[PDB]
Unconditional design. Structure first.
Lengths: 103, 51, 52, 51
């Protein structure tokens, strides 16, 4: 495998390992916050994907606001967060559903 | 605290042992850095010393 | 792309100040855990502030 | 396939009117993605939508 700091790799057949969770620790960092968020409203445009599967179901969401990126989508079944840009643009995100007719 | 009178300092020529440099520090040419990196380093330093 | 597996382990854990005049932050320290994901995914770490 | 669809991003849709080559329509519900249809197969050809 072409990669830095190591050129040895290998992959057997589908293993489906038990767990591969990570561990993140923080010591010090800065982050700027605007706290000047204004009225913003979006809507759903398209929806497609698989059933409850690997790639999931991708849903396109369109927003329109003056702030660069201030959004947090929360719903039952699955929670998805993403970043947007200034103005009106198109964004595609994926969620996890457990029903064929998603209504 | 104060500069007291000294007879040995009347000649105007003082030896090198009367000069003390507090701490061992050396300098070198530097390179300007952006303010974001400096602020991040300051935040990390103030987080590493909470007392 | 998409994101999943939210944590929100250390929300509202800041001790900042007026923040350079209008709004700024100083530091955020804590500890969280990210579960395993499929190759080609994104694990987002959303922070929450009491003021913002 | 059924008709045209109006998309609003600033706020909800209070009321709007659409125009076609030889027909017109007007409908509102108050949501973001609203659908407006004129008839069954009335728009056949090259026309311009003026909302
Ligand atoms: C939404 O409509 C179809 C549905 O799949 C899609 O092909 C199209 O690209 C989407 N619209 C935009 C503006 O991307
Ligand atoms: C928003 O994005 C633009 C372009 O990427 C940048 O110039 C501007 O500084 C950003 N504003 C904030 C508050 O991040």
């Amino acid at each position: 495998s072409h990669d830095s700091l190591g050129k040895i790799s290998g992959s057997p057949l589908d293993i489906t390992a038990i767990r591969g969770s990570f561990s993140v620790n923080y010591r010090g960092l800065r982050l700027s916050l605007s706290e000047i968020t204004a009225t913003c409203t979006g809507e759903v445009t398209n929806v497609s994907g698989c059933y409850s599967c690997m790639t999931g179901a991708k849903v396109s969401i369109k927003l329109h606001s003056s702030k660069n990126s201030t959004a947090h989508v929360r719903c039952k079944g699955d929670e998805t967060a993403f970043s947007v840009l200034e103005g009106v643009h198109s964004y595609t995100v994926s969620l996890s559903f457990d029903h064929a007719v998603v209504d | 605290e104060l500069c007291s009178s000294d007879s040995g300092t009347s000649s105007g020529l003082l030896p090198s042992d009367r000069v003390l440099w507090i701490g061992d520090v050396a300098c070198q040419p530097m390179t300007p850095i952006p303010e974001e990196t400096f602020l991040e380093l300051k935040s990390f330093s103030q987080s590493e010393f909470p007392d | 792309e998409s994101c999943d597996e939210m944590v929100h382990a250390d929300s509202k854990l800041v001790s900042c100040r007026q923040g350079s005049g209008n709004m700024k932050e100083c530091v955020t320290t804590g500890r969280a855990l990210l579960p395993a994901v499929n190759p080609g995914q994104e694990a987002c770490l959303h922070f929450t502030a009491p003021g913002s | 396939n059924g008709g045209v669809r109006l998309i609003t991003l600033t706020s909800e849709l209070k009321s709007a009117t659409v125009c076609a080559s030889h027909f017109c329509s007007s409908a509102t519900s108050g949501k973001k993605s609203t659908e407006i249809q004129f008839h069954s197969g009335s728009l056949v050809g090259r026309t311009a939508i003026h909302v």
